[PDB]
Amino acid sequence: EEWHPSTKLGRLVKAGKIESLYDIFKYSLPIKETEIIDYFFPKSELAEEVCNIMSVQKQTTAGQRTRFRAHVIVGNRDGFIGYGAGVSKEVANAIKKAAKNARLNIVPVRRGFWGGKLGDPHTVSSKLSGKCGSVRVRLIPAPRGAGIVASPTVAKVLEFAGVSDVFTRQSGHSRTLMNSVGAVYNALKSSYSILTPDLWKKEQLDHVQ
Amino acid sequence: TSAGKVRKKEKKEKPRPPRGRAYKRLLYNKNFVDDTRLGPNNLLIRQK
Amino acid sequence: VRINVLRDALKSICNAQRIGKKQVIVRPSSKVIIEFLQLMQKNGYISDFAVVDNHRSNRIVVNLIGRLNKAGVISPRFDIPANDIEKWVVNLLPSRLFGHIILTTSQGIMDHIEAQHRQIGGKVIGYFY
Amino acid sequence: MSKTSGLYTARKLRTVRRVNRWADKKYRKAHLGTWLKANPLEGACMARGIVTQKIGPNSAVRKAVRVQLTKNSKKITAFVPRDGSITYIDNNDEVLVAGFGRAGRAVGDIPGCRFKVIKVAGIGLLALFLRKREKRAR
Amino acid sequence: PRISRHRNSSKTYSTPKKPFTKPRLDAELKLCGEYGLKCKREIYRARYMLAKIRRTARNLLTLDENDIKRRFEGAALLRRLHMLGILDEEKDQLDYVLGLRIEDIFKRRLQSVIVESKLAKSVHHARNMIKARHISVGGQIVNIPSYMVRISNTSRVAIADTSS
RNA sequence: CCCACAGCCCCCGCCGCGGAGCCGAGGGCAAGCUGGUGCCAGCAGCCGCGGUAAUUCCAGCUCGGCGAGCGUCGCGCGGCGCUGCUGCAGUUGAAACGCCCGUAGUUGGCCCCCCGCCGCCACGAGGAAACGGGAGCGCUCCAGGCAGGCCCGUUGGAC
RNA sequence: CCCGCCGGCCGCCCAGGGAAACCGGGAGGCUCCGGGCUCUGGGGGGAGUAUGGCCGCAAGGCUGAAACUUGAAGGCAUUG
Ligand SMILES: [Mg+2]
Ligand SMILES: [Mg+2]
Ligand SMILES: [Mg+2]
Ligand SMILES: [Mg+2]
Ligand SMILES: [Mg+2]
After folding, report:
1. Which of D7, D8, D9 to mutate to probe the C interface, most C CBs <10 Å?
2. Which residue's CA shows the smallest distance to C1' of G66?
3. How far D133 CA lies from chain B's nearest CA (Å)?
4. Range of C98's domain?
5. What distance in Å separates the CA atoms of residue A175 and residue A54, rounded to the nearest whole number?
6. Does residue E3 belong to any structural domain of this protein?
7. Does D25 contact strand F, using a CB cutoff of 7 Å?
8. Could you list the residue range(s) of the whole structural domain that residue E51 is in?
9. How many distinct structural domains can be found in chain E?
């Protein structure tokens, strides 16, 4: 029936004490309930997409046991992206699990300018690199109007994250879709962890929360 | 035995589809303005 | 044998900064090292340092503040035409807004921004950001 | 490192690349000359010869013919693509023979076939297959 | 030899590297329908011109503002854009050029300028009348649908005096 | 009107033919229903189809791409960071000489503020255009060319 | 006896790295990819074969192709 918070953060979100998701991310608080985001994302601002569905088998005494692994990404096209996977005996159940996991884990994306500054940010802040398996990715900021120079799979992730200009290079076995998606996800995740001369400002900490 | 052993319905004499841009205009209304499931049996069942 | 002192110094600096230390010791001092450190200090990356005279390749001590992200050198010092700097900036630096490239010119050691200002070229030494 | 990097080392790098670029199979094939002398077509897109004998995990007999190139006098084997096209080919007849998709290597399940028939007696084989042209002159 | 050998010539369009792409096909068909494009070569031509402008703007922007060549070429490019009506009058900084889109190029075609004036019912009707030489620019009649009008010539477009 | 003469373009009168093909529909790669044949005939650049529903052969219907053009064969560049200066790899996938000495070759710590020479950077002189870039110009547009109106920078063909 | 320094031979191991097994006195400091020098390799066979050259009493060693053929051969690890 009604959603009953099972966590302290969940109860606080049930109340109006927390007003934005950046107030959660800035303290590295984990998210364990799908409601903690949908309450912050009620409208259909976000969007879900199925990337790849693969079947995996386990040999046994009499025949093989088959199952499906699924990958799903979600984003609002405004500095928010998520990626998850799920496995189950049924394709639909695997899709639901993957969607839930993608919703659960999410990170903000920092965006910047190429050379000139004017209007809202349109490309990644700087060069971002990611790694997963044998796959490495490079994201280089591009001028306005340059579009997204990337493969169809990576381009979908960039569009969901909300980036309109970027140059990409892929190395390794890129035909392994999950590893490429993970590499780009990690590169995007690293964005809010690189120190720049603009962030050198020394701010005193606040006791509240 | 004879080669080409493996090797007739009256042609549907219908007005030719328009040529040039008018053909392009046809598809625009075909996929959006006009109700479509592209190519399944049920769609072909309806058109008969 | 020892060849590039600056490379050793920069590698030691980055190694110390990685594990959040506060002071490093570099063994063979030299003028180029001192100018490199002066530029780094002027741009606000490594605070202050001191040189200890022993009559034999003086040592040097630097104090860090956890701002430096990466430093390195280009061993075969290539020549950079005054109009061929943006290619190297794109290839080497994370962005065109922040980061520095060090060149040695007939006018002395200077940042690539200054060289662009005076429309001159020279040889490349290193880079940091 | 594992590569020479001194400021006065252009000659060594040049000779290293010169020596080591010969290890690539494609580059050798293209710039060694043995392939040029061995290829019956002698670098041409297609050649002209004369028919001399009609012959034959998938188990499907294929129809082909033996050809003797006019300009070179050597013997090769060519394959007749379409269905029932062997009848259009008669013993001791002039044909135009081209290559397959792959330059040199065999295509498909056909063993040792690298040439294709495209024109017979001055009329396109595919055109004859669709009845566009006719062989009543022969 | 013949003097005709020294005449120049060049292509005017670029083909996509990946032909089959569903979003691209949808967008191209959409644009063709709105602007009544005869075929897909016009889109390639527009992309070519846009790429040329963008490359010029990039090369100029890579330099310092107080560079004589930068001032010269930027002034020339901005004057051309303003005269052709692709860029708005109030914009004078080189940055605004890089955000341009082919729709802006298309909107200055003769069919579009006569349709926005209410002189034609639709783009297709506009093309049909243009082919039948019933329109005039200034004192001259133009029968090329792709003819591009200039801002100072927009108000001088009318119906051909001799047209029936 | 033009033209050495004839065309052609363009202009003025009368009468008035509106004609689309080439490839494909299992995947790469956008596009699906009946009838034949039965590992035969055939398709298939690669994976593969065909031994009684053949989503792949042969035909009809329908559909997709480009379009006055489409397809096939060979070569070059790209793809390819699979020739790697930028920028590969060398424990086990291909690959560190059995070890030492050693010439040619390549590379060589730190130090003197102001002189000479070599490299280096910047500027300049001198030296064909055409091509390429690029300022200006409405050959009806365009590919193009160096023009045009009038009261023309000495009109211009700058660099 | 225990507290150290230099040199050498070993074991376990946080980071970090890697396809992983594993290394961590490096196989780390590297797509955020430039310390110096030398050697080797470019899908699997044909083949370390043929023909030449040098060496050796010989057995043999060093150097070392092409035509043609083929769609995979291999590494580490998981379930049976
Ligand atoms: Mg082995
Ligand atoms: Mg090995
Ligand atoms: Mg490297
Ligand atoms: Mg390799
Ligand atoms: Mg080999």
Report:
1. D7
2. D34
3. 18
4. 69-129
5. 13
6. no
7. no
8. 19-164
9. 1
